[PDB]
């Protein structure tokens, strides 16, 4: 913003939000895995008990 | 007559806008019937961040916390040089194309406005920097 | 549809752009960043002259 | 420096024309800058002769050198000439070229910037 | 083709009651299915094929 006018900056700044707004989904997708492998852990544990 | 005047008995109230966001609701005539705020109370921020007019009991996230900055400070390195760019372009001969002179301008203040001064200089379009924001920023060389 | 109209230098035909910042464009007239329509400007030396 | 610099010492024959420039270094005179000159004699005040606008345009002259001296000001080199023409004997003087600072938006209500000034002899 | 609007799909007769200042109509999906004929002031509909 301190290098570009209004009219080719939201070419560049698009290509970085897409970017950071796709790193924070796939986080969030391993994270389902993930929570969906302890819980059928913490089933194993609440029979043994 | 001409001078004063009798009239009868009136009220008027007088309120000033403000930049505000609203939740308004439309009933099936399609007129507006109802409306909550959105930074009045925290019943109300939570009831415009759920998208409903009524809340089930627990507890809720709403938005964040922050600190606005209070004064703004500018640091500079104090030179004023004044760059001699009228050295380059008013020369009265400029080497050929096979042996272009490069000359090297350093340790003074740039403007370009005087640059933008003259009426020839048409074909000024600039790839990395908008050439309409050259004033604003310190260059290495 | 409505039409603004004025006769200034040749030089000054640049500045009334939108975003755009120099003598015309900060004390005689000024345009919005967001803009819809456009201009037109025709070199008239035989009329005003 | 921000500073205004003056034109060296030169002697002209009488009958003839003059001319006087005096420059800046470091400082431009924007749209609101004005400046006035002054001659100093030996030994004798200070008589003022006129001042000009870089903005506007409008200049003034004493009425007694109404037609014996032409004031122009010029924005690409940011400086001001003087042309006069047929000198006499009491134009053996000193010149000088007075301007205060000012930048677009306001400044001081007085003359502090100077320079050294021209001798002009007759001979 | 309702001024420069286009589209496809049927149109049927509608019973929504436009105030005088209201041309269009809209759904949670932003996009027009109720439009006024210019020429005869009747309330339209559209729906997709």
Not at chain 2, 44 to 73: A, D, H, M, W
Not at chain 4, 16 to 35: N, P, R
Request: net charge neutral.
């Amino acid at each position: 913003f301190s290098r570009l006018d209004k009219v080719e900056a939201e070419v560049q700044i698009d290509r970085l939000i897409t970017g950071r707004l796709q790193s924070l989904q796939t986080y969030v997708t391993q994270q389902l895995i993930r929570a969906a492998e302890i819980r059928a852990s913490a089933n194993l544990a609440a029979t043994k008990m | 007559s001409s001078s004063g005047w009798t009239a009868g008995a009136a009220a008027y109230y007088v309120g000033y806008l403000q930049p505000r966001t609203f939740l308004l609701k439309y009933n099936e005539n399609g007129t507006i019937t109802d409306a909550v705020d959105c930074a009045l109370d925290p019943l109300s921020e939570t009831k415009c961040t759920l998208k409903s007019f009524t809340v089930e009991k627990g507890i809720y996230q709403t938005s964040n916390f922050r600190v606005q900055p209070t004064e703004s400070i500018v640091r500079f390195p104090n030179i004023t040089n004044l760059c001699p760019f009228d050295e380059v372009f008013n020369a009265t001969r400029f080497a050929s194309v096979y042996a272009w002179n490069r000359k090297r301008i350093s340790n003074c203040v740039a403007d370009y406005s005087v640059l933008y001064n003259l009426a020839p200089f048409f074909t000024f379009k600039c790839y990395g920097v908008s050439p309409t924001k050259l004033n604003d920023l310190c260059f290495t060389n | 549809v409505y039409a603004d109209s004025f006769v200034i230098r040749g030089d000054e035909v640049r500045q009334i752009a939108p975003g755009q910042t120099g003598n015309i464009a900060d004390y005689n007239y000024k345009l919005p960043d967001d803009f819809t329509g456009c201009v037109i400007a025709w070199n008239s030396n035989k009329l005003d002259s | 420096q921000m500073q205004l610099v003056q034109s060296g010492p030169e002697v002209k024959k009488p009958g003839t024309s003059v001319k006087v420039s005096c420059k800046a270094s470091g400082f431009t005179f924007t749209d609101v800058s004005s400046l006035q000159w002054v001659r100093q004699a030996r030994g004798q005040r200070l008589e003022w002769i006129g001042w000009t606008v870089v903005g506007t345009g409008n200049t003034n002259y004493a009425p007694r050198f109404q037609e014996r001296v032409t004031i122009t000001t010029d924005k690409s080199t940011s400086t001001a000439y003087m042309e006069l023409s047929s000198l006499r004997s009491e134009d053996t003087a000193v010149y000088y070229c007075a301007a205060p600072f000012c930048s677009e938006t306001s400044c001081s209500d007085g003359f502090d910037l100077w320079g050294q000034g021209t001798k002009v002899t007759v001979s | 083709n309702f001024n420069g609007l286009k589209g496809t799909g049927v149109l049927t007769e509608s019973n929504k009651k436009f105030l005088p200042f209201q041309q269009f109509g809209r759904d949670i999906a932003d996009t027009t299915d109720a439009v006024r004929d210019p020429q005869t002031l009747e309330i339209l509909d559209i729906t997709p094929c």
